[PDB]
């Protein structure tokens, strides 16, 4: 499953309403209509396994899958055997059938490629008996009881109403993602009330109905439908503020770099916004390709300002065979493209 | 109180085994599954796998299936991602997150720090620093050029300048090597009164430059 966010990075200001985007390739919802109750389920095979029956377990464990088809086959080889010729030898049968019922109830409940938590549901491990052929045996399927509820907890399900397997997260530069909002609509313990989400199918959204300081993040959409989890692409919230234009600066190579070879020149972009900017380099008013690197800071915290470096590197030989050096500089601020010009010979 | 707490940052070259690890605190760790995820520079959250700590069961995204090995010990409260050989692709950040699958739930309360993932033939080498020197404010800096792995730490005057510095991110350069520079903004006639000193420190190459930054 595809999560595409919209906008990808959008600019917003303090106290500002916020609603980000997440579509889906497929539908993350699953369940609603008519149920997985496991108290009741385990309760009444609990009640039946009293009324039929140290276990020896083998040395193989099995998953919920296999387990739960064990224990339907072995109902199953009763039952194929099982002549009734008085009244214990019919209550036994009819109860064999309200254990078959129950077990393959609580299978095709689980056993279903649509089942969101099915593979988390198989790592468990479950113990199988080393022989299953007679009604004494049940006691091994009693004792898995507990750990049968356990799993059954991670796929329960009561009311008709559906749920969206799909999240949220933000994230700050260099800090790990931290859930904000889980099944579409959750609010997380701790988490701001200024922070909502609602959606169904393949559309969900996230709101910030008065954006604050600490709001300027990235956010991630992450859908649980589905194994592989997949997230979305991220919507960067970045701080607006009134159009700067840059202060450039143009940085000849040092003599000790340009005695070992190389010249490296720097021109520099100081605390500008927006952050978009492009740097052209000329030398003898030729425009350079190629042997340029561009680096920018992240927004800053009190100016909401970026800088930007951009570096041409040349071999000693290419730099002194030009004269003028030059860096032209467009930007928004800007109302003509600025140019921070050197010769060579100081 | 509930806390994942992963390995420190990894340099390696390519082909290397490599064994990363996640610690669980403030809960039982046995009770709650713990999923592998990656994010590359740019590039967003990947899904890799998950543990069941209670009983070794795991399962993988098919993409990464056969490449990493997901094992935990529950006795030290610990899961581990392995690689028998990695490859410049495996460079990332790696997290480890708790599962929270009750009922409807399935989501990732708490997660780990992150651990690095540095993919690299590059050995360690210490950085060359060369001023930008300054021609009513004067900008003025440094480069610190042709260093392996990252980071290096830049300061003024012994840190005593802080106002106006802007040390740029690392750009990794086609040779293998990364590159910096960092400037800051001074008043202009500070430039005949103040010495600018730019402190370099490269730790994996014990490498620390001290350089004077003269206008000319």
């Known amino acids: 499953i595809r999560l595409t966010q919209s906008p990808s990075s959008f600019s917003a200001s303090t106290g500002d309403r916020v609603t980000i985007t997440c579509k889906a390739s497929q539908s993350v919802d699953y369940g609603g209509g008519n149920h997985l109750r496991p108290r009741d389920l385990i309760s009444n095979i609990n009640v039946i396994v009293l009324e039929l029956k140290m276990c020896e377990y083998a040395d193989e464990t099995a998953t919920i899958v296999e387990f739960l088809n064990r224990w339907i086959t072995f109902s199953q080889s009763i039952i194929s055997t099982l002549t009734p010729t008085s009244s214990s030898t019919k209550k036994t049968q009819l109860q064999l059938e309200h254990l078959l019922l129950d077990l393959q109830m609580i299978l095709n409940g689980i056993n279903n490629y649509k089942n969101p938590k099915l593979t988390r549901m198989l790592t468990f491990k479950f113990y199988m008996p080393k022989k299953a052929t007679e009604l004494k045996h049940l006691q091994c399927l009693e004792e898995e009881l507990k750990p049968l509820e356990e799993v059954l907890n991670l796929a329960q399900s009561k009311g008709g109403g559906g749920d969206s397997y799909m999240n949220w997260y933000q994230q700050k530069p260099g800090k790990a993602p931290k859930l904000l909002i889980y099944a579409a609509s959750n609010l997380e313990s701790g988490v701001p009330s200024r922070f909502s989400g609602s959606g169904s199918g393949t559309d969900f959204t996230l709101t910030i109905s008065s954006l604050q300081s600490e709001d300027f993040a990235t956010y991630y959409c992450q859908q649980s439908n589905e194994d592989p989890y997949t997230f979305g692409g991220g919507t960067k919230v970045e701080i607006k503020r009134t159009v700067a234009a840059p202060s450039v600066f143009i940085f000849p190579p040092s003599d000790e770099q340009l005695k070992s070879g190389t010249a490296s020149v720097v021109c520099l972009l100081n605390n500008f916004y927006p952050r978009e900017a492009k740097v052209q380099w000329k030398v003898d008013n030729a425009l350079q390709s190629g042997n340029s690197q561009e680096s920018v800071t992240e927004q800053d915290s009190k100016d909401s300002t970026y800088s930007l470096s951009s570096t041409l590197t040349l071999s000693k030989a290419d730099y002194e065979k030009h004269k003028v050096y030059a860096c032209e500089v467009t930007h928004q601020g800007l109302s003509s493209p600025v140019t921070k010009s050197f010769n060579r010979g100081e | 109180e509930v806390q994942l707490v992963q390995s420190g940052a990894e340099v390696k070259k390519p082909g290397e085994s490599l064994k990363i690890s996640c610690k669980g605190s403030?809960?039982?760790?046995?009770?709650?599954?713990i999923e592998w995820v990656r994010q590359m520079p740019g590039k967003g959250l990947e899904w890799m796998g998950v543990i069941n700590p209670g009983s070794g069961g795991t399962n993988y995204n098919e993409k990464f299936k056969g490449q990493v090995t997901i094992s935990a010990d529950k006795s030290i409260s610990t899961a581990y991602l392995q690689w028998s050989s990695l490859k410049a692709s495996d460079t990332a950040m790696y997290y480890c997150?708790?599962?929270?699958?009750?009922?409807?739930?399935?989501?990732?309360?708490?997660w780990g720090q992150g651990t690095t993932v540095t993919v690299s033939s590059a050995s360690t080498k210490g950085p060359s620093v060369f001023p930008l020197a300054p021609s009513g404010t004067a900008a003025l800096g440094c480069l610190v050029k042709d260093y392996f792995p990252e980071p290096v730490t830049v300061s003024w005057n012994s840190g005593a300048l802080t106002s106006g510095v802007h040390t740029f991110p690392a750009v990794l350069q086609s040779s293998g090597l990364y590159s910096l520079s960092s400037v800051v903004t001074v008043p202009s006639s500070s430039l005949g009164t103040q010495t600018y000193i730019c402190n370099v420190n490269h730790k994996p190459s014990n490498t620390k430059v001290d350089k004077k930054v003269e206008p000319k």
């Open positions: 403030g809960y039982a760790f046995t009770n709650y599954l």
């Open positions: 997150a708790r599962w929270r699958g009750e009922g409807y739930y399935a989501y990732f309360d708490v």
